[PDB]
Design a binder for this molecule. Structure first.
Ligand SMILES: Nc1ncnc2c1ncn2[C@@H]1O[C@H](COP(=O)(O)OP(=O)(O)O)[C@@H](O)[C@H]1O
Ligand SMILES: Nc1ncnc2c1ncn2[C@@H]1O[C@H](COP(=O)(O)OP(=O)(O)O)[C@@H](O)[C@H]1O
Lengths: 360, 360
């Protein structure tokens, strides 16, 4: 039984190990938190930090393939292990390119992938003048500040940053795309950010075809292995530009669990194990909605509105096992499937007001 | 957070456990095997046998609602607790009715539920005679013997058995049906036994309609709470008779996980928690096949044919993490979803020869 190593034992990692074991694989989770969510349901867990070079190395050498559910990781030791032959997917090199938002943009531009106009900042006040207000500023490494006036510019993000033209967004889109080392690619439906996800995106065939073609291009240019979450902007001028790349299963890909033949999590395992990719057929439209911790609440998690929300046909719930609720924190998500996406959304919005994660 | 107690740590209980925690419930599993499949992903496990009176008592009293994944359990102690007001679903009384095939037949007959003519054995030889050859003999509690003539009376089943008329079976059908304490019912599509399940059964719609009606009337008569597996016979003469009742999620219902909006396991949780039931809509036809350990293999499980099998579109694998394979033992199942049920069956049977659980 081949062993899959997973760095990061949070929710994304747990869902990963669950699908991996379901496919008959042994899983070792590396997380600093003893009995992490993923470690709890994994075969083994290495209790160490995401930069404990020594331990991440014990994971890689003790696994057939190593993957990860988060980006803030020791990419350096990973590149070394990758260079001497150990299987790490996605490649620590693509992770590196993605870590630094500027180099990610640079990479996308060079490979012919549409992206917002950007500019490395060396002379802040001098560079912003090349865009004029409003302009967008982002931190190169992990955030995003929208400079609209003088007072904001005087209080801009400090550190290594870069500028981006403020994009006139018609809609924000996303698409999961997986790829084998063999080269097979599986592209999912383009979805829409209403944080709520609408699948499929209510957009002209013309645009979804383009969004799918660009998402594939990115993974290809990257020679990626695993599943990737590509965020895009459909502009007010009819242009599709990629905003960011997530080298792992993405929150905007959860709908696949209830709406597609193979979930994003099953694809990721298939992809990193170089197995034949699974069908991405959308069996039914779906609207997903994150269950964030309520504003002004702290402590013991409490889910309210369950009975009433479950009465909505097509509604199902995914509550994560978290011991502490924090405002804005991702406590879970719920999805609504309906033959008619519009009815799916109406219901989801209705439920959104009902389902709340409170404290005590 | 409400607590759900589950007696039985096998694969069914594990699948129930996960779905339960997914809905935000706390789960405590009771199983005589330490680190049982279900206990490993539950919150707590009580190491104890299914007849350890005082231990199942701790489980029920420490839970808001208790259920089970098998029938061979201390039903009498549960009846005691149930009479004290503790929530146990399905009721120990229902479990009691189903555990004995004769009382079960007596019950169905008392409620007008279509069933084969039967008779309790007082004097084996004399009773079979007034029935005529051939006749079917069944143990009341523990399997089936067809008495073709006098000679067979010597090898007849010993103990307390009952007799029933021989039925000329055309097809064997199954249907999952869940019910709330509030009385809400949720009926699934009827499936066809090929051990491989075909969803939906390839039968004239007139039969499907009656099969779902018969099944629903069964759980209604029982005033059942939870999801039930209703096994029926479609005779050569166009009659639909109920043969068996399973008071729990059933193997013939695994298809729901891949082809229906809400799986039988989520449905079961909804029903025992008296919450609104989920949609049973069939999103796409499906064929499920059980994976059993191949003959002559013992020890650590090992799979063969995965790549060739996963190359088949719509094929997904569900390998249970059993710590040892053994001939004929259920190690998991795989499903093949396809818009065309005949292509699903074709693919499934083709893969049934490729996927195999062997020893390492
Ligand atoms: N170039 C841009 N022009 C206008 N709005 C933008 C631009 N880039 C990002 N945004 C907005 O800010 C949000 C943050 O985008 P993102 O780069 O993914 O930051 P984060 O790391 O929080 O996700 C987006 O949802 C989008 O609405
Ligand atoms: N009354 C009957 N007439 C003819 N065949 C029967 C009858 N009852 C059962 N059988 C056959 O025997 C098989 C198993 O009997 P069953 O009642 O399901 O016992 P069990 O499920 O515990 O093995 C059925 O699948 C069916 O093919």
């Amino acid at each position: 039984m081949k062993k899959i190593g997973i760095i990061g034992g949070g929710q994304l990692g747990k869902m990963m190990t669950l699908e991996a074991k379901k496919m008959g694989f042994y899983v070792i989770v590396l997380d600093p938190t003893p009995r992490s969510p993923a470690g709890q349901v994994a075969d083994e867990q290495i209790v160490a930090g995401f930069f404990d070079s020594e331990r991440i190395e014990d994971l890689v050498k003790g696994s057939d393939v190593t993957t990860y559910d988060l980006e803030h990781i020791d990419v350096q030791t990973l590149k070394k292990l990758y260079n001497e032959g150990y299987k790490i997917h996605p490649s620590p090199y693509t992770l590196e390119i993605i870590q630094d938002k500027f180099v990610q943009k640079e990479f996308l531009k060079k490979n012919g992938i549409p992206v917002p106009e950007y500019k490395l900042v060396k002379d802040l006040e001098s560079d912003v003048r090349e865009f004029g207000f409003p302009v967008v500023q982002k931190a190169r490494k992990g955030g995003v500040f929208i400079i609209k006036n003088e007072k904001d510019l005087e209080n801009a993000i400090k550190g290594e940053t870069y500028l981006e033209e403020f994009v006139e967004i018609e809609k924000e889109l996303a698409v999961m795309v997986a790829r084998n080392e063999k080269g097979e690619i599986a592209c999912y439906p383009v979805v829409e950010m209403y944080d709520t996800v609408i699948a499929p995106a209510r957009i002209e065939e013309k645009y979804s075809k383009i969004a799918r073609e660009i998402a594939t291009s990115v993974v290809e240019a990257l020679e990626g292995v695993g599943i990737f979450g590509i965020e895009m902007f459909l502009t007010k001028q009819g242009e599709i530009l990629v905003n960011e790349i997530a080298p792992r299963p993405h929150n905007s890909g959860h709908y696949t669990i209830e709406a597609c033949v193979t979930s994003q999590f099953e694809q990721h395992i298939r992809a990193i194990m170089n197995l034949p990719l699974g069908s991405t057929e959308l069996l039914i439209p779906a609207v997903m909605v994150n269950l964030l911790g309520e504003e002004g609440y702290y402590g013991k998690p409490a889910l309210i509105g369950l009975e009433e929300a479950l009465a909505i046909e097509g509604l199902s719930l995914h509550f994560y096992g978290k011991k502490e609720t924090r405002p804005y924190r991702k406590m879970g998500h719920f999805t609504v499937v309906d033959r008619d996406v519009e009815r799916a959304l109406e219901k989801a919005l209705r439920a959104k007001k009902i389902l709340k994660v409170v404290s005590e």
